[model samples]
Target: KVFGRCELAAAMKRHGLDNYRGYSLGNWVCAAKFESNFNTQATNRNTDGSTDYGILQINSRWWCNDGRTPGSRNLCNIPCSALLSSDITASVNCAKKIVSDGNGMNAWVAWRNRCKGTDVQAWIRGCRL
Candidate 1:
């Protein structure tokens, strides 16, 4: 199932992602928009033959495993299927770990290519906490 922007924003806020590492809530919402359109079951095959998993579109090369995708670092210690679930707990936890480490929000290419330097303010227009 796909979540709306307001639902995603509230979830991110619940997970304390709004100010995590000083990343804007708009960026996270924008990343999800470009990556998965808020669909938890979203998956894609990259040009390099790696698979991007779940709402965050985490790549198989570094984060999770899909059995067929080889050489996965599995740094998140999760099955790619877990990310595909409607319950986003595992996905969110892994996302927190990913964003907290490494390139932070830049870890997601969607964030870099789409959300970066863009006016993503409308991503969280009027959702009240």
Candidate 2:
């Protein structure tokens, strides 16, 4: 699913991403936009041979197991395929785990590059919470 901006905001909020780990819903939305453009089925291969999967581009090397990333930690304990689903529960849960691991939103380079310390409220503007 390629969600509209507001749709993604609403979904992320419903999934408890709003202010999770002190990061705002807009931060997540902005990261998703820069990482995967809100596309559930998005995937990107890294130079180190791991792949980023799903909307937020969770990495296979440390988070989800793609069964191909060398020395995968599988920290999320989920198959990489689960992140590609439109339901987003697995993705959201895994994202929480990533944040809870003390990485915070900085775990995603997209967030650091585009969202961190920026005015991200515009990412969810006009989206009724």
Candidate 3:
């Protein structure tokens, strides 16, 4: 709430990168920056509201595919829009889904872990979660 995912992960890094070793912190920041521009309350106004999407700007309708319940009004649902929603846990989880590729933590750092050198975001969206 106080900070975007990038800021939060950076702040939380003093603790640790969860299970990810060698790259967790940086990848998380790269992912957030690429997806939400580090704006916690960010939103998408495609064509100036032609398609107003929510946090993570997931395009509520298009991304709510696969018959799975998207971001729920009462619970922390999958495929969440991190920018518009205040549910931090749900947002983080959704972001995790993006970075983990549904294969648990295999590729977390690729999307959630930081790599060496510059331009991490170049590898962010192109890779599986």
Candidate 4:
């Protein structure tokens, strides 16, 4: 189900992604699948009492008290802990905004390049995406 095109397309929209350009929506999901099987609610608790959750494995407890959502009191006020929302587009957009700040498709593109059996980081160094 990770490669489900329709679902992926919807997810891209949630992140305000109208174009995949160098990296398709499928590419992002593929990376998430490898990391967490498309499960946005995924999380883990560290022995030190810290926590990581969502598709991107965010260490949310220290960063925000609530999930991603507009006007949330969490540091940035962006929703990062909405359970069901996290499993969908909200999580994707939240990760995209934080990781790339919507600047360029570098992060997503690099992920896909690595997926194609390219050298972990070296194969994608010169990529402009």
Tens digits of per-residue lDDT, candidate 3, 6-60, equal 4456443433443343445545555455555655565554432222223333433
The TM-score of candidate 2 is: 0.97
lDDT of the structure predicted as candidate 3 = 0.43
Residue 57 accuracy (lDDT) in model 3: 38
State residue 78's C-alpha deviation in candidate 4, in Å.
4.4
In model 2, state the lDDT of residue 42: 98
CA deviation > 4 Å runs, candidate 4 = 1-6, 18-23, 61-63, 66-80, 83-87, 101-129
- RMSD list, candidates in order: 1.3, 0.8, 8.8, 7.9
All candidates in order of TM-score, best leading: 2, 1, 4, 3
lDDT comparing candidate 1 with the true structure: 0.85
- Measured against the true structure, the TM-scores of the candidates, in listed sequence, are 0.91, 0.97, 0.44, 0.50
Could you tell me which 10 consecutive residues in candidate 3 have the lowest summed lDDT? 48-57
Error of 4 at 108 (Å): 9.8
Candidate 4: clashing pairs of residues? 67-79, 67-80, 67-81, 67-82, 68-79, 68-80, 68-81, 69-78, 69-79, 106-129
lDDT of 1 by residue, 39-90 (tens): 9999999877789889898778888877767676888998889999877777
In model 2, state the lDDT of residue 52.
96
Would you list the C-alpha lDDT of every candidate in the order shown?
Answer: 0.85, 0.93, 0.43, 0.48
Report the Cα lDDT for candidate 2: 0.93
